Specification:
heterotetramer, A: about 400 residues, alpha+beta, Serine Threonine Protein Phosphatase 5, Tetratricopeptide repeat, six-stranded antiparallel β-barrel, about 15% strand, B: about 180 residues, alpha/beta, Rossmann fold, six-stranded mixed sheet, about 20% strand, globular, binds guanosine-5'-diphosphate, Dedicator of cytokinesis protein 9 (chains A, C), lipoprotein (chains B, D), identical protein binding (chains B, D), Cell division control protein 42 homolog (chains B, D)
Chain lengths: ~400, ~180, ~400, ~180
């Protein structure tokens, strides 16, 4: 049977993922197997759901378009435990809801006790990690291969790679060298460290090229509203984003543009594989002032979120604030005001507004920090306080208003 | 328990590649595609044996015009990153003359590491030729080991922002020493 | 509003029940209030169920033929905690299932953790008490009042009373004296200690009469199969039973008849009240041999259940076995064989069969006990063993077969 | 933990109402509507401060023709119920002469109670007259208290199977003493 083949394939894929420690991909394998058995059993009138109660756990289930109740029950418990190991706690109830009525009908109170013990722990973990930020579900990367000579059918193909925990650009890079150098000889593998859409029309046909770009999950305004939690923004994700500096590479503020590329994968993560082909992509260019505006916005919200907190972080507050007003190495937020807020485009009602919100933020930041310094700083806070006020005059100056 | 926030401070001569490595590691970007920023300092979460740490990276100006204000950010430091370019011999000299002395003063017991940068330049004809013409070779690891223990650094580490070799290790050891 | 009145009534009934310590009746009040709010909110399109997801908890809900989601949520948590206090653990999931999707939609993980903690404990309690038999859900009694002079509208009326834990006949009796003596003077209250259908056609119109009969939940063969657990046989019960000795009162075996009366209450227990009018009743008479057969059956099963056990009870095994073969005070199972199994009715294929199963039971009983005596008995087991064999001969004798 | 099973043994003269009270309490019936049984002994669950106990009630023949076999069931007893009728003076006398001596022998440390029965007969003309004609009054509580402590019973209790007054208390105290 094809359901039996598919199963076999998914179950070995799972042991591989388990071996590699890629638990969410293992979990997805369990779910796909389970959804397959459920669908079949539903057609036979033994089960009541199939595929679609699993569509909530993963949209990829749609791809699955001997077996009995007892098998189903054992697979469901397998998915539940799978999801626990992936640390995808929020999802366990979706599985157990399917097996609860079966246990009730069988009067299996011991099983019910266990499942509800797991759900209690799971929802307990959820509040923990929502607060401790110790759940690390993965980092994502655009990887592209170039060189018919060594990659063949792989030449030109782009994937999203999903990597463990906090895997840095630097680390996945190396790993793909050591991987493809041990396969295509050392001096034959080259790495493209540039994020631009590259044309083979200038690659040495002698080498295998690998391009690796860090990307993050992308959502539009509607999606950001459906997905309120960080977990919802880390589960069932299909679109990824990166931004690229360009000039009409990296220049001065007056001329700094930005390209935002949105990549759409053919399936969502998590999936039964840890890499997924890119289906489609497009981009959006930003002017230097749009850039300014956008950059400024991110900083004020950054500060506010730091200020308006209970578990306030003194170090992370100074770091952000010092790098806000006591700027030593880089240009300084004033560079935006000098190059953009002098005497164009009436959308500046944004650029100014943000500068209004910016000062208010550093102030509140100073204010907050005033109440954290163990005196040994104190002077440090004064220079900052001094710089804040100083620049505050500069902005007020050019904008012809108070600060 | 909420996440711990290790204040780390970077010091070393101007033009050794301080800002470059900080931005590179923390934005997960290669040098060539930094979206330029008007702001200083960097925050990064690193995974050190099971635990997530938020690393706070304070960038310092290395020039004399800033000798007086630089140390304002020295209170509270949990570890120091003292940078020098393995292809800038003067860089190395400041380590012993200006840098580790400057810090050892204010934060006497605070641990520091010896960070050597731009190590990919070791395989550069132009740079090598430049060195030869002044009768010089790039600092080698071992020689930098020596300096390290002599000046009593926790250890010495080296990396290239450009090829990102050693980059991860640097900030790892950084966290280890701060702990 | 009538829903608001009904509510008010149920909520005060509940505080009264709580005060009296009648927790299941309090719980039922919470459920009825909750089912009322749910029904109303369902009509308004705010909730999705109403009355009938509560029909599983209690059929009496059918009787309920300002308010908002948040109220509903608070009432549901109230029912859940109500049921916990009544020790009706099995029923808590029926309530929580209604509030789980609301919590999920609100992303209230703390609440979800708590509810699943309760369900885990609940199902944990369930296996405990299924084994430790320490859950005591109540004893039931037919109570009837006679005397227009003092009871008025209550004269002639029969109720089922549901009493705490293991309330003995002796105890509820007294309690109704002290209750109705303190209301209708001491020497004015009389107690009828006879279970027969009584006609006022011979009561002293001067006194208030109270008749109290112990009754137990009754189920037909279909119901005994739908209700597998003791809890299912203690929840939603509408029919009660008692047996009465009669002669065509108590005589010798040859003539001993039995009347089985089944009483049907107008609502099921548990209910918003601890007494419920009898709606209807009927009875079934049994011959002396039917009686014999029935009595014999109960004993063999009694012994088997004792024998075939893990947590075997030596005392309760000897007690039942001694009273089986070493009969001192009463007649002796042989009295059935002598008066019925000599040389009628061919249904004796039952009376004999049971006597076949009876010896086999005492044997296994002896056998089991052989392995429990701390020697200090030993001799005791021998007399028993001696009596078993002795009578075994007597039965074999009269039945013309082995034993 | 599974439920504890207290073996209790009932002893006293024939015709004091031993079997009557046992069946009455355990079947939750008044004497008049016992469905007669061919079997001996009785099991009842009683509630003693939170806990359910399964009480095992062993019924003994009180006649001499059974003096030899009666004690076979005395091993393992956790408590004894020594019964006498408060309207049968001989009943009371056997308590001291035959009964508490018979048991104290085999089960020396085993606790027993003094159970007085048929106390509703105290308010009976026929019975009272019967007593008077032999120059007798029913045993009164206090006199029975005396006997009790003298013979060293845990205490004395009395009941009527017929009016079921005292019935509950009897088997309660029975469980208390066995504990
Ligand atoms: N080839 C190479 N150049 C580097 C590296 N790191 C930094 N640079 C270059 O060194 C120059 C100055 O570095 P900068 O970031 O300003 O260091 P800082 O002055 O100490 O803050 C820049 O042109 C960088 O591109 C590296 O690892 N390799
Ligand atoms: N009036 C009255 N009669 C009783 C009571 N208890 C027992 N009897 C009667 O006493 C007689 C003998 O009692 P029985 O059960 O055989 O006691 P046993 O011989 O010691 O086992 C029976 O006729 C009973 O009906 C009681 O509490 N009140």
């Amino acid at each position: 049977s094809t359901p039996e083949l598919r199963k076999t394939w998914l179950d070995s894929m799972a042991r591989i993922h388990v071996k590699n420690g890629d638990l969410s991909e293992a979990a997805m394998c369990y779910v796909h197997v389970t959804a397959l058995v459920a669908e079949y059993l539903t057609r036979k009138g033994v089960f009541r759901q199939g595929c679609t109660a699993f569509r909530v756990i993963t949209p990829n289930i749609d791809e699955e378009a001997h077996f009995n109740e007892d098998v189903l029950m054992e697979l469901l418990e397998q998915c539940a435990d799978g999801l626990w190991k992936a640390e995808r706690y929020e999802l366990i109830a979706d599985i157990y809801k399917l097996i609860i009525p079966i246990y009730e009908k069988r009067r299996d109170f011991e099983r019910l006790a266990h499942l509800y013990d797991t759900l209690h722990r799971a929802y307990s973990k959820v509040t923990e990690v929502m607060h401790s930020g110790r759940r690390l579900l993965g980092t994502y990367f655009r990887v592209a291969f170039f060189g018919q000579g060594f990659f063949e059918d792989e030449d030109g193909k782009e994937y999203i790679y999903k990597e463990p925990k906090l895997t840095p650009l630097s680390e996945i890079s190396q790993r793909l060298l050591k991987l493809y150098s041990d396969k295509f000889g050392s001096e034959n593998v080259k790495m493209i460290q540039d994020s631009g859409k590259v044309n083979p029309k200038d690659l040495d046909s002698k080498y295998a090229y690998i391009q690796v770009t860090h990307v993050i999950p992308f959502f539009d305004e509607k999606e950001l509203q459906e997905r309120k939690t960080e977990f919802e923004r880390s589960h069932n994700i299909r679109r990824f984003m990166f931004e690229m500096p360009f000039t009409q590479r990296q220049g001065g503020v007056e001329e700094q543009c930005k390209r935002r590329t949105i990549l759409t994968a053919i399936h969502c993560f998590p999936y039964v594989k840890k890499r997924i082909p890119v289906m489609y992509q497009h981009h959006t260019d930003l002017n230097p002032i749009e850039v300014a505006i956008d950059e400024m916005s991110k900083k004020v919200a950054e500060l506010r979120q730091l200020c308006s907190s209970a578990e306030v972080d003194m170090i992370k507050l100074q770091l952000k604030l010092q790098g806000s007003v006591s700027v030593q190495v880089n240009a300084g937020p004033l560079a935006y005001a000098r190059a953009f807020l002098d005497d164009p485009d009436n959308k500046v009602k944004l650029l100014k507004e943000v500068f209004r919100q910016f000062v208010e933020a550093c102030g509140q930041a100073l204010a907050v920090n005033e109440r954290l310094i163990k005196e040994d700083q104190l002077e440090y806070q004064e220079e900052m306080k001094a710089n804040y006020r100083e620049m505050a005059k500069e902005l007020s100056e050019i904008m012809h208003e108070q600060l | 328990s909420h996440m711990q926030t290790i204040k780390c401070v970077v010091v070393g001569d101007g033009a050794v590649g301080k800002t470059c490595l900080l931005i590179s590691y923390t934005t997960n970007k290669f040098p060539s595609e930094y979206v330029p920023t008007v702001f200083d300092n960097y925050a990064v979460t690193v995974m050190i044996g099971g635990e997530p740490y938020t690393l706070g990276l304070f960038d310092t100006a290395g020039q004399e015009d800033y000798d007086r204000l630089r140390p304002l950010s020295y209170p509270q430091t949990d570890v120091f990153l003292v940078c020098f370019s393995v292809v800038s011999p003067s860089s190395f000299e400041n380590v012993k003359e200006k840098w580790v002395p400057e810090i050892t003063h204010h934060c006497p017991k605070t641990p520091f590491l010896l960070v050597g940068t731009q190590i990919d330049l070791r395989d550069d004809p132009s740079t090598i030729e430049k060195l030869a013409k002044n009768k010089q070779k790039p600092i080698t690891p071992e020689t930098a080991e020596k300096l390290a223990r002599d000046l009593k650094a926790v250890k010495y580490v080296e990396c290239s922002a450009l090829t990102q070799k050693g980059l991860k290790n640097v900030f790892d050891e950084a966290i280890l020493a701060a702990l």
